[PDB]
Amino acid sequence: GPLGSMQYVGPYRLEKTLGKGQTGLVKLGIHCVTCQKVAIKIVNREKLSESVLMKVEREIAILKLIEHPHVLKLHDVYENKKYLYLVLEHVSGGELFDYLVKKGRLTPKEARKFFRQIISALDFCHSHSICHRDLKPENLLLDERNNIRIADFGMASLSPHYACPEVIRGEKYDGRKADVWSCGVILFALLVGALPFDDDNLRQLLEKVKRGVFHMPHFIPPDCQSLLRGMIEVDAARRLTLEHIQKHIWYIGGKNEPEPEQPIPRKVQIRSLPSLEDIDPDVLDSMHSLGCFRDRNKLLQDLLSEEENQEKMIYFLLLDRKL
Amino acid sequence: GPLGSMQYVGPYRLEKTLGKGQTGLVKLGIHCVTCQKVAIKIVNREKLSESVLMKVEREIAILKLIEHPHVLKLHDVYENKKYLYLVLEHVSGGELFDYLVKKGRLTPKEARKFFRQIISALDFCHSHSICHRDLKPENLLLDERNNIRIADFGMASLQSPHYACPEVIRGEKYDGRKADVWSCGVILFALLVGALPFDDDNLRQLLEKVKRGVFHMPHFIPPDCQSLLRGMIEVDAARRLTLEHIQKHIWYIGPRKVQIRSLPSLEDIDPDVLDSMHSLGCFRDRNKLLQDLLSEEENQEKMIYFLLLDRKL
């Protein structure tokens, strides 16, 4: 691990490095009492903007509170002055394309099993105001039963083949729409065994993606083809929403096929806060203590505003947790 | 793995991805008969420029023919036009600094144990005209005994300024042997201290520190060891210690090498060896090949020649 990074994080002793990249270093953690395996992601906190840290600490608080069978579970977070430590579900089946490579290309039935896992996880996270924004194959981890866990939700604040044109142009984009594009590209790869946009040269690849023209092989069924074209759509306004996707017959036709699907976790019911009076004193207090919410008045404003936001989401998650 | 990559490499079945980065993607491989595990590194030849591809394939050709107990063994090389597949020794003990984290800092005696492994491996590779040039802690793998295997020799052109000598940081022409010595000094310091000699929260300032080359040497570091570190982390590459000097150092003191020979004339060139060299691929310009074999200088062309000659022997 990095120099000066503790040998223990909470009850977890740090063992070998599992992997690393720009968003941090991952080590295997062992619980000192129960000896359970976790993956611990270590993030350097000194090299982040304060606005970034705020956004991150917010998404983190949400992710710690929710659970989905196809989202890598964030169990806890630990902080010292320099390093942030994320305690994550430990999975070791590899990544989704390892499976794809072995098969060459997947049948529409198998591709769709994976697609339903991915869409379900995205729908869930989007419902809690969390977009991925950087969805790519290495984020699609496999457990031992060959089921997906999507990793790295909320890490974006800290590749071009899977990015939508608006991301490639560094424009200000809808996160949900970016995830839809990325999922389209991944669905394509599952069905074809090749990418819709590829080039030996970077500069050329970027233009292909921005242009958004790709060829679909005949062996992709027409129902599925109409789904792919709606997702891999350059006009973000015209691009399918997750709502459109989940209403689509090809999608729906996959329910419990070939196998029964994991239990659907309950989504928290989020309501309006008409006035200061309707805010729970103990939940407000616990939120106010967090750090990213140290300014009580700005916290009150964000909770009472008409806008949907992560402040409201956290509040209702905590409220739900109390009951 | 990468799309378009093989499902089988020689007798090895490709399984899960082990890790990846700029220099390629590593997959777990399983021998279809013996069930022996290997690590298979996949590298995209097409993304590479002309001179880079050649430099890499030349060094891989040397690496596949030699073996040292502290260098990650390269067993073989396979190629489809799109991908190179490097079949490597499989190691899973973690990396050196995982050990360092558990201890905090090493005793001078324990640090010397690792240091001798590292220097031994580099002296072996340098003897075969191979410098690492990009030595960093994550290259220092551990097997199950907590012994070192240095990985990623030959990959530097496919590309951590904390470990790079000032000449490498400055992007100037340099002796690769001298760069490795600097990187080993920084690593040795880290094992003894549990902190880097040059560190900074901002990249720009870190490069400056490395270039100026001033660092704080803790009092608990023994003075003959302290003299070693000063000789290695020396900004003047002409003044910096050689591996030969390191191996004779009082603190330091406490595998078959093949020797390059001269080829005065074309008549001295074994036709079987040349044919094997022609078949490698990193030698497109065959006139340039011959010039390099007949030149007055040590080079990787001669090294490959003599490794092939010895192997036929």
Numbering used by the authors:
A (entry chain B): 9 to 166, 179 to 343
B (entry chain A): 9 to 167, 179 to 273, 285 to 343
Task: Give verbatim lines from the article.
The SAD (synapses of amphids defective) kinases, conserved across a wide range of species, play important roles in multiple phases of axonal development and function. Despite the diverse functions, the AMPK family members display similar structural organization, with an N-terminal kinase domain followed by a non-catalytic region containing an ubiquitin associated (UBA) domain and, in some cases, a kinase associated (KA1) domain. The C-terminal non-catalytic region of SAD kinases includes two short conserved regions, SCR1 and SCR2, which respectively contain the characteristic UBA and KA1 domains12731. In this study, structural and biochemical analyses of mouse SAD-A revealed a synergistic model for the autoinhibition of SAD activity by two separable elements, a newly identified autoinhibitory sequence (AIS) and the UBA domain.
To understand the autoinhibitory mechanisms, we first determined the crystal structure of mouse SAD-A fragment containing both kinase and UBA domains. This KD-UBA structure comprises a head-to-tail dimer per asymmetric unit, which is probably a crystallization artifact owing to its monomeric state in solution. The kinase domain of SAD-A folds into a canonical bilobed structure in which the N-lobe consists of a β-sheet and the prominent αC helix and the C-lobe is composed mainly of α-helices. A flexible linker connects the catalytic domain to the UBA domain of three-helix bundle. Distinctly, the SAD-A kinase adopts a third binding mode, mainly with the N-lobe of the kinase domain and weakly with the C-lobe. The KD–UBA interaction in SAD-A primarily involves two helices, α3 from the UBA domain and αC from the kinase domain, which buries ∼1,500 Å2 exposed surface area. Six conserved residues from the UBA domain pack against a hydrophobic patch at the C terminus of the prominent αC helix. Structural comparison reveals that the KD–UBA interaction in SAD-A brings helix αC into an orientation that is rotated outwards approximate 90° from that in the active kinases including AMPK ortholog Snf1 and the prototype PKA. The N-terminal portion of the partially disordered activation segment folds back into the active site, strictly preventing the formation of salt bridge(s) between Glu67 on helix αC and Lys49 on strand β3. Therefore, the distinct UBA binding mode and the inserted activation segment lead to a typically inactive (αC-out) kinase conformation, where the important Glu67 is 12.5 Å away from Lys49.
